[PDB]
Amino acid sequence: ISEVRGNTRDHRTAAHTHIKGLGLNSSGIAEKQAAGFVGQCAAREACGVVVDLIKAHKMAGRGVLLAGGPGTGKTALALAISQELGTKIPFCPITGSEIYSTEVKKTEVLMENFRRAIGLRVRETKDVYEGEVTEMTPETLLIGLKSARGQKKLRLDPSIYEAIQKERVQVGDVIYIETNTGACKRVGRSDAYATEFDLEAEEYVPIPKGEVHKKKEIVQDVTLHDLDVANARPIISMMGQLMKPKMTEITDKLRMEINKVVQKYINQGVAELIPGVLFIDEAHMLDIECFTYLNKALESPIAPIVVLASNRGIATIRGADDLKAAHGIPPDFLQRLLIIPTHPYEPDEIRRIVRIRAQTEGVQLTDAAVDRVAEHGVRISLRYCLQLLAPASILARVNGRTQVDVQDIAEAEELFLDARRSANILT
Amino acid sequence: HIRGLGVDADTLEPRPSSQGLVGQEKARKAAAVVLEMIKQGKIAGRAVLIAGPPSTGKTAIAMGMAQSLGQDVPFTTLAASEIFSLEMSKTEALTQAFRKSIGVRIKEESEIMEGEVVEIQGKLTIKTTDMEAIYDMGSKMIDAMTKERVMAGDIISIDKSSGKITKLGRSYAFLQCPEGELQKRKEVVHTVSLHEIDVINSRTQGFLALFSGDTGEIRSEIRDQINTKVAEWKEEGKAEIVPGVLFIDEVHMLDIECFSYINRALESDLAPIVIMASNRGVSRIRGTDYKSPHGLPLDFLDRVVIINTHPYTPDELRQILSIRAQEEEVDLTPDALALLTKIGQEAGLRYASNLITTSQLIAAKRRAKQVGVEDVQRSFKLFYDPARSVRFVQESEKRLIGNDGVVD
Numbered sequence: 064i065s066e067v068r069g070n071t072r073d074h075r076t077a078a079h080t081h082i083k084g085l086g087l088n089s090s091g092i093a094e095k096q097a098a099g100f101v102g103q104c105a106a107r108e109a110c111g112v113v114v115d116l117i118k119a120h121k122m123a124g125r126g127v128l129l130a131g132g133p134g135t136g137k138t139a140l141a142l143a144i145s146q147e148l149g150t151k152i153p154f155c156p157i158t159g160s161e162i163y164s165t166e167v168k169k170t171e172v173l174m175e176n177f178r179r180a181i182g183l184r185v186r187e188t189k190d191v192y193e194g195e196v197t198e199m200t201p202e203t204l205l206i207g208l209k210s211a212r213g214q215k216k217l218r219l220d221p222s223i224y225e226a227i228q229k230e231r232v233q234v235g236d237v238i239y240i241e242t243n244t245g246a247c248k249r250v251g252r253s254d255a256y257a258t259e260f261d262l263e264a265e266e267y268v269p270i271p272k273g274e275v276h277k278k279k280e281i282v283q284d285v286t287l288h289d290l291d292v293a294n295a296r297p298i299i300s301m302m303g304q305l306m307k308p309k310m311t312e313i314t315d316k317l318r319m320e321i322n323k324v325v326q327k328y329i330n331q332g333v334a335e336l337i338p339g340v341l342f343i344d345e346a347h348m349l350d351i352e353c354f355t356y357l358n359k360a361l362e363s364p365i366a367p368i369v370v371l372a373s374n375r376g377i378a379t380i381r382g383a384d385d386l387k388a389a390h391g392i393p394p395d396f397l398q399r400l401l402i403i404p405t406h407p408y409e410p411d412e413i414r415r416i417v418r419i420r421a422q423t424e425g426v427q428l429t430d431a432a433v434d435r436v437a438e439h440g441v442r443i444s445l446r447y448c449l450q451l452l453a454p455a456s457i458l459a460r461v462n463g464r465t466q467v468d469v470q471d472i473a474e475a476e477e478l479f480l481d482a483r484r485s486a487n488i489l490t
Numbered sequence: 491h492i493r494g495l496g497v498d499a500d501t502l503e504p505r506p507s508s509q510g511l512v513g514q515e516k517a518r519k520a521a522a523v524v525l526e527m528i529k530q531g532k533i534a535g536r537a538v539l540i541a542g543p544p545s546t547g548k549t550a551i552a553m554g555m556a557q558s559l560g561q562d563v564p565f566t567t568l569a570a571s572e573i574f575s576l577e578m579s580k581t582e583a584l585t586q587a588f589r590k591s592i593g594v595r596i597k598e599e600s601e602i603m604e605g606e607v608v609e610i611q612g613k614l615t616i617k618t619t620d621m622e623a624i625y626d627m628g629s630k631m632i633d634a635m636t637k638e639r640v641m642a643g644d645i646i647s648i649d650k651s652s653g654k655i656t657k658l659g660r661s662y663a664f665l666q667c668p669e670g671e672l673q674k675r676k677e678v679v680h681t682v683s684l685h686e687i688d689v690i691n692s693r694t695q696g697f698l699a700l701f702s703g704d705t706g707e708i709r710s711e712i713r714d715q716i717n718t719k720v721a722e723w724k725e726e727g728k729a730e731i732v733p734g735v736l737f738i739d740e741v742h743m744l745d746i747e748c749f750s751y752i753n754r755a756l757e758s759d760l761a762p763i764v765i766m767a768s769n770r771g772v773s774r775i776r777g778t779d780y781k782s783p784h785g786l787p788l789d790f791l792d793r794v795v796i797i798n799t800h801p802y803t804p805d806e807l808r809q810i811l812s813i814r815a816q817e818e819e820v821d822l823t824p825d826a827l828a829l830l831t832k833i834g835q836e837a838g839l840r841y842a843s844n845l846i847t848t849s850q851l852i853a854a855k856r857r858a859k860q861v862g863v864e865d866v867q868r869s870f871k872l873f874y875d876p877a878r879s880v881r882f883v884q885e886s887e888k889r890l891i892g893n894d895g896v897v898d
């Protein structure tokens with residue numbers, strides 16, 4: 064579990080790195096401009112209440128729905144819900160279109176995302192005693208350990224004395240003993256007393272490196288999916304390795320081996336598992352079979368916070384014989400969650416956002432350029448205008464400038480056109 | 491106990507009692523010539539034959555042949571009867587014997603315990619001029635140094651890889667105490683026989699092997715792994731093949747199929763020194779219908795080099811029984827040893843050696859620190875020698891001679 068390192072899809076949250084959380088005071092009322100947020104007071108305060116409902120454990124089989132248009136702070140508020148829940152919490156942003164896979168089933172892909180939303184907080188402090196054995200009999204046992212770069216003799220507690228007698232010991236055996244109720248023995252194992260005659264033996268163990276007394280500090284924050292993806296290999300290259308269509312490395316029997324060891328760490332009290340947040344954009348795209356999986360998922364106490372988002376008003380239920388419902392959510396699951404409405408930003412609110420994103424991205428710009436780009440944030444979507452910051456900075460650097468002006472941003476619209484305008488131009 | 495051959499380096503004239511060997515000058519001088527015959531290459535693929543009366547140190551002379559060849563050359567004793575086993579083919583029984591004789595020399599890094607001893611299943615404490623430590627005795631380690639006769643105050647070197655304890659000397663009655671810490675890993679030469687490499691790499695024999703199960707029949711698959719690794723080590727220069735010495739006792743008992751294998755194993759350029767030992771004058775060959783001198787086929791007698799041992803004189807017998815008396819930790823009066831050697835004149839040396847251990851217990855019941863003549867005379871009258879026991883049965887069976895002096 065120490066070797067297991069967390070691999071996170073940072074490209075999804077890359078557009079929200081400018082947001083630090085949810086800007087609100089002690090009473091609960093949202094601030095005008097805090098934590099990288101502009102406006103959206105009604106929706107900010109609303110989910111600022113749901114974070115408390117999770118903390119108070121009052122979200123008994125409940126979820127959240129973010130109703131609003133494109134670029135209305137939906138995905139942004141979802142990340143704020145995680146950021147406000149605790150430190151190093153799992154946030155899994157998905158889109159209904161991601162479920163629509165070619166090889167894996169509609170929920171074999173929804174399963175790993177649920178595993179990507181449930182984490183594990185580890186806080187294990189162990190006192191290592193590695194090396195050989197040099198027995199002495201006092202009034203309750205003295206053993207001298209020999210390591211690769213050190214030698215130390217220690218007067219063991221009578222608790223260890225009972226544990227060592229159970230697992231046969233002799234002078235010249237490599238051992239791993241722990242003060243925190245730990246007993247492990249390697250009978251006769253020692254590379255020092257190994258002859259070159261026998262090779263197939265493997266009955267000997269090398270002399271442990273460093274010192275005998277070692278203070279092992281384990282502070283690990285990994286999701287359940289990280290445990291599955293690390294135990295699948297028969298690991299640095301794996302962050303860029305996926306070129307295989309089948310993806311048969313993750314099998315149901317491999318997950319059972321993870322579920323049992325995770326349970327063992329909870330029973331010991333070493334590490335407790337912490338459920339996070341599962342965000343589903345394009346919630347209407349989800350099949351009826353997916354919603355019934357979610358209904359079963361929400362009933363489990365281990366389950367994370369299922370936050371959905373739908374840009375549609377009235378939509379046909381996917382997986383049903385054409386049944387129009389609100390946001391495309393079936394009634395069975397619509398009642399299961401509380402709806403939070405996300406309001407569109409007026410031109411005055413849009414330029415306040417631009418200045419925050421430019422400051423984070425590292426793009427210097429004139430006051431007049433912010434006004435021109437905000438005009439595109441109201442005529443077209445908020446995502447399109449925000450995308451104009453990076454090409455205009457290159458166009459300015461090329462012209463020798465650091466400050467981006469109207470002339471530089473005018474070319475950005477000419478070169479990089481939105482999906483709506485690009486279609487109409489072709490006629 | 492046996493130090494070596496006990497012969498002069500230049501003149502090759504043996505001393506009456508030297509290097510753990512007593513008497514048999516004629517045989518020991520002949521033994522010294524054989525060793526020189528092999529060294530010069532004069533004798534090539536030729537067996538030795540120690541013929542003579544029973545219990546004339548035949549094993550000891552061959553033990554002397556070993557130590558006088560090299561520092562750590564393998565020597566193994568094999569009785570011809572032991573070959574005919576209920577479980578293990580006499581081929582495997584002979585292959586094990588030959589593999590026990592051929593060794594390999596490899597320089598290895600291993601820790602050696604060097605320091606003075608302070609004696610007590612048990613616990614024996616060791617000491618150096620810099621550090622002191624207590625060590626719990628292993629069951630097999632106790633049996634290992636009791637054969638070495640290790641006493642308190644002795645300076646010893648225990649190689650942990652082999653388990654052999656070597657007496658370097660003593661500090662007080664001399665060699666001084668070692669400086670540093672006991673365990674020191676050095677590049678030491680290890681000489682382990684082919685059969686021992688097989689028994690190390692093969693399945694470990696469980697407790698009470700004679701209670702039930704197959705014998706030490708090493709699998710053909712395991713032996714293959716060793717042979718191929720030894721051959722790879724010869725070419726590399728890692729191992730040096732050293733041909734030891736095989737001692738075969740009760741040779742008259744060997745079948746015609748054994749001698750064909752012995753010559754086949756003797757055919758090799760790295761073959762060991764095969765020493766044969768016959769305690770018989772005239773004996774028939776087994777497997778063959780024809781008779782021969784020592785029970786050897788008509789083809790073997792011409793190839794073999796024969797050496798003869800002679801019967802020990804009362805003065806030669808005098809020290810042998812006293813050496814065995816000290817080894818068994820018994821104290822005898824001068825009259826008792828004179829009587830014990832007088833037994834060794836008509837009856838065997840081995841029978842007289844058995845009367846040593848028996849007389850001690852009768853002397854223990856009398857509560858005496860000196861084993862006397864009346865103590866020895868008891869053992870002779872209680873326990874009978876083979877020739878007297880058969881005489882006792884024959885008379886009890888049928889009274890061959892009557893009171894009148896008439897036979898039948």
Ligand SMILES: Nc1ncnc2c1ncn2[C@@H]1O[C@H](COP(=O)(O)OP(=O)(O)OP(=O)(O)O)[C@@H](O)[C@H]1O
Nearest residue numbers: 078099100101103133134135136137138139416446
């Ligand atoms: N109130 C806000 N304050 C600061 N930035 C905001 C605010 N609302 C939206 N944004 C930013 O607008 C940019 C693009 O919008 P985004 O893709 O996040 O739309 P969304 O409404 O959050 O989700 P959806 O994709 O479902 O519309 C992001 O960088 C987001 O953080």
